Design a protein around this ligand. Structure first.
Ligand code: POV
Ligand code: POV
Ligand code: POV
Ligand code: POV
Ligand code: POV
Ligand code: POV
Ligand code: POV
Ligand code: POV
Ligand code: POV
Ligand code: POV
Ligand code: CLR
Ligand code: CLR
Ligand code: CLR
Ligand code: CA
Ligand code: K
Ligand code: K
Ligand code: K
Ligand code: K
Ligand code: MG
Lengths: 462, 202, 298, 214, 117
C-alpha cells in the first residue's frame, strides 16, 4: 500500500503534463495498464478494510474511503472507455495521510516527536498537492458563465509554485488565478492554508535539528593521563578549578581534564572550554549511568573529582547526591581514585563505610565543615594561621607594585605555595635542622616536614 | 436512554453529511445565481427579430487575426474587412450585422472574421466566399436576428451566445445536491427512530 | 570551448576522493588483523595550540583568517559584476594573484586544522572543511587554466560562520548576549549571501531542457534584494525567479528562509538596544546641598 | 514577518570510541546522496518528459525542394550592441516548400524549431547585422543557395504530422548530450551515496572484529 | 459566532466602501480616474490585502481608495491575524475517543481502568 500510493501519485504527475481530455489505447498504454493494476490492488485493500470495519457507515464516511470512491471508479471507467480525463486524479495525494499510521503498524514509528513530525509532513504535503491539483483543474477549464473562454494555461508545477507563494504570504503576483472559480477557491484557501503554513512550518523545523551537540565519548591518548570531573559544574566552579589546576607555577604537567555533566553548557561555559580547547573536553551525560562512565573512559582515568554545591539549600540532600555519585562510580570501577567534597562530617562517616572506599589507596573526602572548624581552632592557638594555611594551597604568581603599602608585603608572602618532592643524597646523613638552615637561603627553600611516616617539624635527633 | 450501541456515531456522521449537502446545495445555488445574473439579463434583454440585408461591402481596410501551431507558436495574418447592414424590427433603421457577440467584441469595426488559416490569401478567399454568399441574400428569406436597443444600439447578431443547456446544468446539480442531502437526513432519522422501536419491542 | 565542469569536477573529486581514502584506510587498518608520548601526538598538540589563540602566532593566524575571509568575499563580490565564464591572464591579473595567495593561506589553515583534528572523518564532514573543498580547488584550477568560471564562489560567504568562534578564541566575546548576537548575525548574513549567489548562478544559466535559452540577466545585488524581499514576505513582484530551477530553489528557500527571518530579526533587535537609561552619576553643584534618598522607593 | 508577534504570541556494546560519531555522519551523508540522486532523477524526468516526447514524435524523412520564393512582405529582427542597447531592422521574407515522406503533400520548410516559433509566417531569418541592406544581402545569399538545390540531393528533414502538420525542419533542436548529462550525474550521485554507506558499514563492522580479536 | 459575525460583516462592509470609492473617482481629478471594479473583485482584493498576500493583480488606484487602503491595512490585518487562528482553534474541538464498545457474541471482554500510562 505504501509503495503503490506513491506509484499512483507519480502516475498522476506524469499525466498532469498531457491535455485535459484525450483518447488512448488501453492495449497499447503501459501507464494505463499499470494504473489499472494499481487500482485493482486499491479495490482489494478497500474490500479488506470494509470487511474489517466495525461500523460500516462510519467506515463509508472515513476520508480514505472517500479518497477511494473519488479515485478508483474513474480509473475503471477510463479503462472501459479507452479514454482519459484528468479530473479529480489529484485526490491521489490524500493517500499520504495514512503513511504515519501504516508506519506505526510496522513498528517503525515509536517516539512521539517522530510520530508528530511524520504526521505534520504528510498533512502539509498532501494538502499542498491536492489544493494545487484542484486549482490546476479549475484554472485550465474556464468559467461556464464565460463559456470556458477565460481559461488560463497553467501547468501543475506552476500551480504548485503559486500555492507555495500564496501560503507563505509572499505573493509575487507573477502567477495568480484569473478565473472566477479559481479566485473563489483562492479566497477559501487563503483562510486555511496560511494558518496551516504559519503553524506547521515552525513546528516541523523545531522537530528537526534536535541533535545532541555534546555526544560521543573521550578517546584516550597513549602516554598521557586524563582526569574526569563531575558533580557541581557551573561557569564559576569550572573557571576557579581550571585557574588552580592549570597554573603556571606547577611543573609541565599534561593531564587532560574531562568534564561529565547532565546539563548542556551555556554560551559562557562553551566559550570557557574554547579558551582551554587543547586541555579540556566536555561530554554530556549522567555520572549514575554506566554507559556514560564508559564513555568518559573512567576505567582508565587517573582520578575522579566530584565538586559539591557549597551554597545548596539542603546540605543533607547535597550530601546524599554526592554519596550516590560516589556509589555509582565505585560500583562501575572499584579501583578509581575519588576526590570529593563533603559538607558535613556525619555524612562523611556514612560515606566511608562503602566497601570500595579505600582511604589508603588515595580516596580523599575533603570535609568542608571539618577543615574550616579546624582552621578556626588553629587561629585560636595563633591568630592569622587560617589565612596562612589557606594561601599555601591557592596557586598564585608574584605581583609587585611601586607603592609602599602593606599590600606589597602581603602579596610577596602570598606568592608561595606548599609543594612535595624527593631530596638529594647530598643531604642524607645530616640532621633535619641542619638541612633546613642549608636549604633556607642557599637553595632558597623552606622545609616544614619530611616523609613514623608523616612527621611535622622533626627534632634535631632525626 | 443511551440504549443505542456503536451505530449512533455512524448515524450522527450521516446527519452531518446530509446537512452539509443541504448547505452546499443552497450556497452553490446563490453563488451560481450571482455569476449567471449579468449574462442572463444581457441575454434576456436581447429580443428576437426578422431581418433582411440592405447591403454587403468592403471598407478597404485590413485587420490582424492570430494563427496557431502547437505548444505556444502563434503569429498574425491580415484579413480584409466586410461590413453588412440590415433591416431591423425594433428601431426600423440602419444597424451593422455581427455574426455573434464574440465577433462584435473581437472586432466591433467589422462584420465577419475568418478562422485564421496561415496565409493572407486563404483569409481573403474565405472572406470573399462568405461575402458572395451574403451579397445575393436580398429579401430571399427574412432570416431571424437578435437585437438590443439598450446595449447594441446599432449592432445586430445572427446567434444567441448564451447556451441554455449550460445554465440548466449549473442550477440542476446544486438542486440535486440539496435533495440528496434532505433524503440522507430523512433516512438517517427514520433508521435512528425505528431502532428505538425495535429495541423497545424486545 | 567552455570549461565550467573542470572547476566543479576538481571540487567533487577532492571532497569524495578524500572521503573514500579515509574510509579505505579505516577498512584496511582493521583488515590487517586478518593477515596477523609519540611525535604524532606532539605535532597534533602543536597544531591544536596554533588553531586556538593560546599563543601569539596562533592569535596572528586567527586574525589573518578573519581578515582573509572578508578579503575573499570582497573578491567574489568584484567578480560577480563580470560575465559568467572568461579567459584572463594570471600574470597580468592582480585580483587572480591576490585570490591565489588567499587560497594558499586557506590551504595552509586547512592543513593545520586537519593535523589538529581528533577524528579525521568527523573533520572531513565538518562544514568549514566542505566550504574549503568547494572553494579552494577551483581557484587552483583557474590559476592553472588561465581562465575563470563564476561557479560555486558564493560559498565563500559561509566563512562568516566561524567569526564568532574565532572571536571567542581571541578572548573578545565573553558574555552570552554578545555571543548569541554575533552568532545570529553571522548565520543570517552568510545564509542570505550564499542563497543569493546560488539563485544568481541558477537564474543567469538557464534550464538545460530549455537549452539555456530562458536565462534571466540578474545581477548579484538584484538577487540579494530579491532574497530580502522574499524572506520578509513583502513580495513586490518587480524581481522574481523565472527559470524552473530558480523557482524550485525559491520554493525550498521559502520554507527555511522565512522561518529564519521571522525568528532571527526580532531576536537580534531585542539583543541590540539593551542600554541602561538611568546610568551615569550625579554632578555636584557648588553652593547647593543635595540629599540622597534610598530604601523603599515606589 | 509571517505572524504579527507570533499570532499574538498566545496562539502558536559501546566499545567503539569517538569514531562512532564520524561514521554515523558518514551514513547520513551517504543516505542523503541516495535520496538526492533519486529525487533529482524524478525532477529531471518531469522536466525532460514533454521536450523528449515532442522530439521522439518527430520522424526522420527524405525531402526535396518544390520551390523557393519571396512573399514581398518584411519583418523585424532585433540587432544588439553591448549592455542593453538594442534596435530593430527589417528583413525580406523567403518561403520554401518541400516534398514530404509521411503526408506526400505540400509543407513549408523552417530551418529549426526556434525559427518556426520566432516567425512561423516565414522560412528563414538572418542574424541581424545592423542595416537592412546586410539582412537583404544575407537573405538573397541563402535564397540563391537554396533555389538551385532542385533534386540535387534528397536532403534529410524532420517532420511531425501531429504538431507540425504542414511545417518541416532541417535540424533536431534536442541535444542528446545535454539530456545524457542530466540523467548521468544524478545516477553518479546515487552510486557514490551507496558506496559511502557500504564502506562505512564495512569499516564499522570490521572495527568490532578487530576489537574482539584483542 | 461573535468572531465569525464580526469578521464577515467587517469584510463585506469594507469591500462595499472600497467598491463605492473606486467606481466614483477623485473630485480633484474630476472623477476621471475611476476604476471599474466589481463588488466581488473588491471582496477578493480585501481578502488578499488582509491575509498580507498582496498579489498586485487587483489594487486601488484612486487617491481616496489608497487612503482608505492605508487605514484598513492598520485594522484589517490585526483583525485577520487575531481572528482566523482563534476561529480555527474554536472549530475542530472534537473528541477522538468517543462512542462506546460494541459487544461481540461468543467473545468475552475485559474493562481496565485506574492508573493508565
Ligand atoms: C512501486 C513504484 C512506484 C513509483 C514509481 C513507478 C511509476 C510507474 C509509471 C512509470 C512510467 C512508465 C511508462 O509507461 O512510461 C511512459 C513514458 O513516460 C516515462 O517514461 C516517464 C518518465 C519521467 C519520470 C516518471 C511510456 O511511454 P508512453 O506509453 O508513450 O507514455 C504514455 C504517457 N505519456 C505520453 C503521458 C508519457
Ligand atoms: C520510507 C520512509 C521510511 C521512514 C523511516 C522512519 C524511521 O526509521 O523513523 C526514525 C526517523 O524519524 C522519522 O521517522 C522522522 C523523519 C522523517 C520521516 C519522513 C517519512 C516520510 C513522510 C511522508 C513525506 C511525503 C512523501 C512523498 C525514528 O523513528 P523512532 O520512532 O525514533 O524509531 C525508533 C528508534 N529506532 C528505530 C532507532 C530504535
Ligand atoms: C475540493 C477542495 C479540497 C481540497 C482540500 C481538502 C482536503 C483537506 C484535508 C483535511 C484534513 C486535514 C486534517 O486535519 O486531517 C486530520 C486527520 O484526522 C485525525 O487526526 C484523526 C483521524 C484518525 C489531521 O489533523 P489533526 O490531527 O486534527 O491536527 C493535529 C492537531 N491536533 C491533534 C492537535 C488537534
Ligand atoms: C519521489 C520524489 C518525486 C519528486 C517530486 C518533485 C517534483 C518537482 C518537479 C517539478 C517539475 C518542473 C516542471 C517544469 C516545467 O514543465 O515548466 C513549467 C514551469 O514549472 C515551474 O514553474 C516549476 C515550479 C517548481 C515546483 C516545485 C515543486 C516542489 C514540490 C515538492 C513536493 C512534491 C512531492 C512550465 O512549462 P511550459 O514550458 O510553460 O509548458 C509547455 C512545455
Ligand atoms: C585583507 C583585506 C580584505 C579586504 C579587501 C581587499 C580586497 C582585495 C582586492 C581589491 C581589488 C584590487 C584590484 O586588483 O582591483 C582591480 C580593479 O577593481 C577595483 O579596484 C575594485 C574597486 C571596487 C571596490 C572593491 C584592478 O584592475 P583590473 O586588473 O583590471 O581588475 C580585474 C577585475 N575586474 C575587471 C572585474 C575589476
Ligand atoms: C571586527 C569585529 C570586532 C568585534 C568586537 C566585539 C566586541 O568587542 O564585543 C563587544 C561588542 O559586542 C558584540 O560583539 C556585539 C556587537 C556586534 C558585533 C558584530 C561583529 C561582526 C559579526 C559578523 C557580521 C558580518 C560581517 C561581514 C562586547 O563583547 P563582550 O563579550 O561584552 O566583551 C566583554 C566586555 N569588555 C571587553 C568591555 C570587557
Ligand atoms: C565591508 C562592507 C561591504 C559592503 C557590502 C554591501 C554591499 C552592497 C552593494 C550594492 C551595490 C549596488 C549595485 C548597483 C548595480 O550594479 O545596479 C544593479 C541593481 O542593484 C540593486 O538592485 C541594488 C540592491 C541593493 C542590495 C542590498 C545589499 C545589502 C547587503 C548587505 C550585506 C552585504 C555584506 C543592476 O545593474 P544594471 O545596471 O542592471 O547592470 C548593467 C550595468
Ligand atoms: C521531505 C523533506 C523532509 C526532510 C526530512 C529529513 C529527515 C530528518 C531526520 O531527522 O532524519 C534522520 C534520519 O535520516 C537519515 O538517516 C538520513 C538523513 C538524510 C535524509 C534526507 C531527507 C531529504 C536524521 O538523523 P537525526 O535524527 O538528525 O540524527 C542525528 C542527530
Ligand atoms: C447565503 C450565501 C450567499 C453567497 C455568498 C457568496 C458570494 C460569492 C459570489 C461571488 C460571485 C462571483 C462574481 C463573478 C463576476 O461577476 O466576475 C467578476 C469577478 O469576480 C471575482 O473576482 C470573484 C471573486 C471571489 C469573491 C469571493 C466571495 C467570498 C465571500 C464569502 C462571504 C459572502 C457572504 C468580474 O466581472 P466582469 O465580467 O469583469 O464584469 C462584467 C460582467
Ligand atoms: C461560514 C463558514 C463557517 C463554517 C462553520 C462550520 C460549522 C462548525 C461547527 O462546529 O458546526 C457543528 C454543527 O454543524 C452541523 O451539524 C452541520 C455541519 C456542516 C456545517 C457546514 C458549514 C459550512 C459541527 O459539529 P461539531 O461541533 O464538529 O460536532 C462533532 C464533533
Ligand atoms: C458496498 C455497498 C454497495 C453495500 C454495503 C453492504 C450492505 C448492504 C450491508 C452488508 C454488511 C452490512 C453490515 C453488517 C453488520 C453490521 C453490524 C450491525 O450491528 C449493524 C448493521 C451493520 C453495520 C450492517 C450494515 C449494512 C451492511 C454494510
Ligand atoms: C590532486 C587532485 C585533488 C586534483 C583535483 C582534480 C582536478 C584538478 C582534475 C580533474 C579533471 C582534470 C582536468 C581534466 C581535463 C583537462 C583538460 C586539459 O585541456 C587540461 C587539463 C584539465 C583541465 C584537467 C585539469 C586537472 C583536473 C581538473
Ligand atoms: C588528505 C586525504 C586526501 C587523505 C587522508 C589521509 C588518510 C588516508 C590517513 C592519514 C592519517 C590517517 C589517520 C591517522 C590516525 C588516526 C587515528 C585513529 O584513532 C583513527 C584513524 C586515523 C584517523 C587515521 C585514518 C586515516 C588517515 C587520516
Ligand atoms: Ca607562587
Ligand atoms: K506577508
Ligand atoms: K506579500
Ligand atoms: K506581496
Ligand atoms: K506583489
Ligand atoms: Mg583534546
Amino acid at each position: 500500500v505504501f509503495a503503490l500510493s506513491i506509484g499512483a501519485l507519480v502516475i498522476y504527475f506524469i499525466d498532469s503534463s498531457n491535455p485535459i481530455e484525450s483518447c488512448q489505447n488501453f492495449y497499447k498504454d503501459f501507464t494505463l495498464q499499470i494504473d489499472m493494476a494499481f487500482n485493482v490492488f486499491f479495490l482489494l485493500y478497500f474490500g479488506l478494510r470494509f470487511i474489517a470495519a466495525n461500523d460500516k457507515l462510519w467506515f463509508w464516511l472515513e476520508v480514505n474511503s472517500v479518497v477511494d470512491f473519488f479515485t478508483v471508479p474513474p480509473v475503471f471507467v477510463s479503462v472501459y472507455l479507452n479514454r482519459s480525463w484528468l479530473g479529480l486524479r489529484f485526490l491521489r495525494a490524500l493517500r499520504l495521510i495514512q503513511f504515519s499510521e501504516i508506519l506505526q503498524f510496522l513498528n517503525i514509528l515509536k517516539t512521539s516527536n517522530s510520530i508528530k513530525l511524520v504526521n505534520l509532513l504528510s498533512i502539509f504535503i498532501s494538502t499542498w498537492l491536492t489544493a494545487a491539483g484542484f486549482i490546476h483543474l479549475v484554472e485550465n477549464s474556464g468559467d461556464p458563465w464565460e463559456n470556458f473562454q477565460n481559461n488560463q494555461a497553467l501547468t501543475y508545477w506552476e500551480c504548485v509554485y503559486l500555492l507555495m507563494v500564496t501560503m507563505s504570504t509572499v505573493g509575487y503576483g507573477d502567477v495568480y488565478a484569473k478565473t472566477t472559480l479559481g479566485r473563489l477557491f483562492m479566497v477559501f484557501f487563503i483562510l486555511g492554508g496560511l494558518a496551516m503554513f504559519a503553524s506547521y512550518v515552525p513546528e516541523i523545523i523545531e522537530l528537526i535539528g534536535n541533535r545532541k551537540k555534546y555526544g560521543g565519548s573521550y578517546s584516550a591518548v597513549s602516554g598521557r593521563k586524563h582526569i574526569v570531573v563531575c558533580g557541581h559544574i557551573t561557569l564559576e566552579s569550572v573557571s576557579n578549578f581550571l585557574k588552580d589546576f592549570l597554573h603556571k607555577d606547577r611543573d609541565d604537567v599534561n593531564v587532560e581534564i574531562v568534564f561529565l555533566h547532565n546539563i548542556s553548557p551555556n554560551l559562557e561555559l562553551e566559550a570557557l572550554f574554547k579558551r582551554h580547547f587543547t586541555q579540556v573536553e566536555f561530554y554530556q551525560g549522567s555520572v549514575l549511568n554506566p554507559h556514560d562512565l564508559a564513555r568518559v573512559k573512567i576505567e582508565s582515568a587517573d582520578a575522579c573529582l566530584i565538586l559539591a554545591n557549597k551554597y545548596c539549600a539542603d546540605p543533607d540532600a547535597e550530601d546524599a547526591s554526592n554519596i550516590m555519585r560516589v556509589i555509582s562510580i565505585k560500583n562501575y570501577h572499584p579501583k578509581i581514585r575519588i576526590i570529593t567534597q563533603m559538607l558535613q562530617y556525619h555524612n562523611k562517616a556514612h560515606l566511608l563505610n562503602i566497601p570500595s572506599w579505600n582511604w589508603k589507596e588515595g580516596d580523599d573526602a575533603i570535609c568542608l565543615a571539618e577543615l574550616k572548624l579546624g582552621f578556626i581552632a588553629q587561629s585560636c592557638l595563633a591568630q592569622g594561621l587560617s589565612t596562612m594555611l589557606a594561601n599555601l594551597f591557592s596557586m598564585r604568581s608574584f605581583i609587585k607594585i611601586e607603592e609602599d603599602t602593606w599590600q606589597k608585603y602581603y602579596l610577596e608572602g602570598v606568592s608561595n605555595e606548599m609543594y612535595t618532592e624527593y631530596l638529594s643524597s647530598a643531604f642524607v646523613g645530616l640532621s633535619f635542622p641542619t638541612v633546613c638552615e642549608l636549604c633556607f637561603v642557599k637553595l632558597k627553600l623552606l622545609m616544614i616536614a619530611i616523609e613514623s611516616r608523616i612527621l611535622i617539624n622533626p627534632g634535631n635527633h632525626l | 436512554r443511551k440504549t443505542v450501541t456503536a451505530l449512533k456515531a455512524g448515524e450522527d456522521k450521516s446527519i452531518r453529511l446530509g446537512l452539509f449537502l443541504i448547505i452546499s446545495g443552497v450556497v452553490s445555488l446563490f453563488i451560481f445565481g450571482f455569476c449567471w445574473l449579468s449574462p442572463a439579463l444581457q441575454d434576456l434583454q436581447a429580443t428576437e427579430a426578422n431581418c433582411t440585408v440592405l447591403s454587403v461591402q468592403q471598407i478597404g481596410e485590413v485587420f490582424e487575426c492570430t494563427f496557431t501551431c502547437g505548444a505556444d507558436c502563434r503569429g498574425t495574418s491580415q484579413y480584409p474587412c466586410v461590413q453588412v447592414y440590415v433591416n431591423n424590427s425594433e428601431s426600423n433603421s440602419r444597424a451593422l450585422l455581427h455574426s455573434d457577440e464574440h465577433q462584435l467584441l473581437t472586432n466591433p469595426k467589422c462584420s465577419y472574421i475568418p478562422p485564421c488559416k496561415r496565409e493572407n490569401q486563404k483569409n481573403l478567399e474565405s472572406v470573399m466566399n462568405w461575402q458572395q454568399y451574403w451579397k445575393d441574400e436580398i429579401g430571399s428569406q427574412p432570416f431571424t436576428c437578435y437585437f438590443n436597443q439598450h446595449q447594441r444600439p446599432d449592432d445586430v447578431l445572427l446567434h444567441r451566445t448564451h447556451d441554455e443547456i449550460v445554465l440548466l446544468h449549473c442550477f440542476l446539480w446544486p438542486l440535486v445536491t440539496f435533495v440528496v442531502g434532505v433524503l440522507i437526513v430523512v433516512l438517517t432519522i427514520c433508521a435512528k427512530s425505528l431502532a428505538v422501536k425495535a429495541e423497545a419491542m424486545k | 570551448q567552455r570549461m565550467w565542469w573542470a572547476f566543479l569536477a576538481s571540487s567533487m573529486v577532492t571532497f569524495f576522493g578524500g572521503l573514500f581514502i579515509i574510509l579505505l584506510w579505516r577498512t584496511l587498518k582493521y583488515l590487517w588483523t586478518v593477515c596477523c608520548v609519540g611525535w604524532m601526538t606532539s605535532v597534533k598538540d602543536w597544531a591544536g595550540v596554533m588553531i586556538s589563540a593560546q599563543t601569539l602566532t596562533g592569535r596572528v593566524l586567527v586574525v589573518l583568517v578573519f581578515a582573509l575571509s572578508i578579503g575573499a568575499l570582497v573578491i567574489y563580490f568584484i567578480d560577480s559584476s563580470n560575465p559568467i565564464e572568461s579567459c584572463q591572464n594570471f600574470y597580468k591579473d592582480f585580483t587572480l594573484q591576490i585570490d591565489m595567495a588567499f587560497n594558499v593561506f586557506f590551504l595552509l589553515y586547512f592543513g593545520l586544522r586537519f593535523i589538529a583534528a581528533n577524528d579525521k572523518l568527523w573533520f572531513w564532514l565538518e562544514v568549514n572543511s566542505v566550504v574549503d573543498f568547494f572553494t579552494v580547488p577551483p581557484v587552483f584550477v583557474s590559476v592553472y587554466l588561465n581562465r575563470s568560471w563564476l561557479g560555486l564562489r558564493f560559498l565563500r560567504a559561509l566563512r562568516l560562520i566561524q567569526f564568532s568562534e574565532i572571536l571567542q578564541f581571541l578572548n573578545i566575546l565573553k558574555t552570552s548576549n554578545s555571543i548569541k548576537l554575533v552568532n545570529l548575525l553571522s548565520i543570517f548574513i552568510s545564509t542570505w549571501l550564499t542563497a543569493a549567489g546560488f539563485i544568481h548562478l541558477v537564474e543567469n544559466s538557464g534550464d538545460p531542457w530549455e537549452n539555456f535559452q530562458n536565462n534571466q540577466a540578474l545581477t548579484y545585488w538584484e538577487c540579494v534584494y530579491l532574497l530580502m524581499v522574499t524572506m520578509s514576505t513583502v513580495g513586490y513582484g518587480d524581481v522574481y525567479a523565472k527559470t524552473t530551477l530558480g523557482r524550485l530553489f525559491m520554493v525550498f528557500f521559502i520554507l527555511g528562509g522565512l522561518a529564519m527571518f521571522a525568528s532571527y530579526v526580532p531576536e537580534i533587535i531585542e539583543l541590540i538596544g539593551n542600554r541602561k537609561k538611568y546610568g551615569g552619576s550625579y554632578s555636584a553643584v557648588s553652593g547647593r546641598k543635595h540629599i540622597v534618598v534610598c530604601g523603599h522607593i515606589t
